Each structure stands twice: as structure tokens, then as C-alpha cells.
């Protein structure tokens, strides 16, 4: 024939291991609007749930981070390196600039596009402390 | 692989079948060497590390410790005599959970208080439910 010999039940083709429609596009808007811009000053109207607010656990039983201010924005704001150094020196961690630059380099290797927030620095500071204490428990006994 | 009788010594289980693999075993007529309910592939060290503390429970605990005059005197006297003593921070061989940081030996910071929660529990925000050591084992394995 001029065409092929497809019997039109062969149009059912899509099997796993082919085409792989994993990361194409997901049409529609999510319930938690985590893709569009976040309001620094939310409207009196405009109930949209921009990724702010919280769950009922975080509102009924809030952490005292959330009490008297400081919400999750202040922990994942990109922040300046000298600002983070000043914050942690005021807290009293007391590291020299060599160790601070090493920790900053590790934190910016973990986090993409630079950034390094105070929560990321706290997490890598927890990793380093846990590594040091695990090495002490490794080379020493069980006191 | 290994049955639970040789590896499971606590209440917690990091690889729980969740009510559905048991029907696979019973419908496929699996003997208790391939059954999920009886046999797992977790390992004995992972059951020990399935706790969420990185500290060690003191076996039998001092029961009162705050309500007795002896409790108050042992609070008051050795308050300034215990800061020199160290903590028992699990085992570095046993923990296959901390990230690999290369230097780790010449970089020191002085003033820090050890958080009770595991740093992998605390850093569950960067891996995108409430994080539990079951999620931790299912993520840092397989």
C-alpha cells in the first residue's frame, strides 16, 4: 500500500522506558504558591498562601523562634558573609577567619548559587561539631 | 537476608513493611526466610543508630534526680566539675550518616552548645512530612 500496515491498535504505544514524560511541564497553579513572588507586605485582601503562614502545629504550638518575631524568612534569607560572621561572633562562637572561610566554602559547596543562609551555616556548623565529637569517641573510649 | 531475631533489639524499626508487603508474602506463599515480617535487610548497626539522639541513655536512670536533697547537692557541687568531662557521641564507624567533610581536623570553633537532635534530623529542610529516623534510614541507604 501507499501507507504502512498499522492496524490502528498500534497507536497505543506509550510504555515505560520510552519518551519519559517526567520533567516536561505541570500545568495549573499549586495550592501553596511557592513559585510566584512572596509579599513583604501582604494585602489586606489577597488570601493566596504564598508559602508564608504555617500549619496548625506552627500556629497553635509555635516555636519561640516564631514567638516575639523572627519567622522562617530570616533563616533562609541569602545573607552577607560578614553579616553572618558578625551574628555568630555576637552569639559567641569565636572562630578565626581561616575556619570561618573554610566553613563558608563548605556551606557554599552544599548550597547552590552561593547564598549560604544562617540556617545553612548552622547546619554545617552542626555537621562539623558532630564529626569532631564522633572522631573523639572514635579515638577515645566510652566515658 | 537476616531475620529480625538477630538484628532487632529495640522497639523501633527503620524499614517497616507497612501492612502491604505481608500480603505479598502470604499470597506468594513465602517461607520465613523470605518473608518481610520475619526477615529484613537492615543490619544490626542500623537498629542501634535508629535512635534520634546521638547520645547514650544511661541504662538505669537516676529516678528522682531533682526532688531529693541529695539530688540538689549533687546538682550544686559538681556543676563546675563536669564541664571538663566529655560526652559519648556514638561511634564514628557505626555512623554512616554524617556527610563527608575532608579536613575536619584543624578547623575548630570554641563556643557552641551541642543540639540534642541529630544534625540529619535538623537538616531535613534541604531535601525536597515530619522527618523521622525511618525516613532518615530510607534516604541515606538504597
Amino acid at each position: 500500500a501507499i501507507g504502512g500496515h498499522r492496524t490502528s491498535a498500534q497507536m497505543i504505544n506509550a510504555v515505560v522506558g520510552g519518551v519519559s514524560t517526567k520533567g516536561y511541564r505541570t500545568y495549573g497553579v499549586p495550592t501553596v504558591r511557592s513559585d510566584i513572588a512572596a509579599p513583604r507586605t501582604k494585602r489586606i485582601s489577597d488570601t493566596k498562601n504564598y508559602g508564608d503562614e504555617s500549619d496548625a502545629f506552627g500556629l497553635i504550638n509555635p516555636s519561640m523562634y516564631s514567638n516575639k518575631g523572627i519567622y522562617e524568612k530570616d533563616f533562609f534569607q541569602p545573607r552577607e558573609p560578614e553579616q553572618i560572621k558578625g551574628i555568630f561572633s555576637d552569639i559567641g562562637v569565636e572562630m578565626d577567619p581561616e575556619t570561618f572561610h573554610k566553613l563558608w566554602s563548605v556551606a557554599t559547596s552544599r548550597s547552590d548559587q552561593g547564598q549560604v543562609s544562617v540556617e545553612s551555616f548552622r547546619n554545617v556548623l552542626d555537621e562539623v561539631q558532630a564529626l569532631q565529637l564522633a572522631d573523639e569517641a572514635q579515638n577515645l573510649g566510652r566515658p | 537476608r537476616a531475620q529480625l531475631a538477630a538484628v532487632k533489639e529495640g522497639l523501633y524499626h527503620p524499614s517497616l513493611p507497612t501492612f502491604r508487603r505481608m500480603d505479598m508474602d502470604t499470597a506468594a506463599h513465602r517461607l520465613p526466610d523470605e518473608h518481610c515480617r520475619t526477615t529484613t535487610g537492615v543490619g544490626p548497626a542500623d537498629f542501634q543508630n535508629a535512635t534520634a539522639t546521638y547520645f547514650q541513655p544511661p541504662a538505669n536512670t537516676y529516678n528522682g534526680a531533682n526532688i531529693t536533697d541529695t539530688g540538689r547537692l549533687l546538682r550544686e557541687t559538681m556543676k563546675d566539675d563536669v564541664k571538663s568531662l566529655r560526652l559519648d557521641w556514638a561511634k564514628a564507624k557505626d555512623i554512616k550518616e554524617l556527610p563527608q567533610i575532608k579536613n575536619t581536623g584543624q578547623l575548630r570553633f570554641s563556643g557552641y552548645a551541642v543540639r540534642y537532635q541529630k544534625p540529619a534530623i535538623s537538616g531535613s529542610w534541604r531535601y525536597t512530612q515530619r522527618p523521622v529516623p525511618a525516613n532518615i534510614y530510607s534516604r541515606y541507604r538504597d
Binding site: 516555636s63 519561640m64 | 537532635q117 531535613s124 515530619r130 522527618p131
Partner: peptide
Amino acid sequence: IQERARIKPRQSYPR
């Protein structure tokens, strides 16, 4: 996951 405020024990009658 982040830690909550302490349980204040209400010390009513001290010594």
C-alpha cells in the same frame, strides 16, 4: 522540628 519553650515548673513555695 525546631524546639519549643521550656515547661516552667511553677515554684510556688521556695526554701
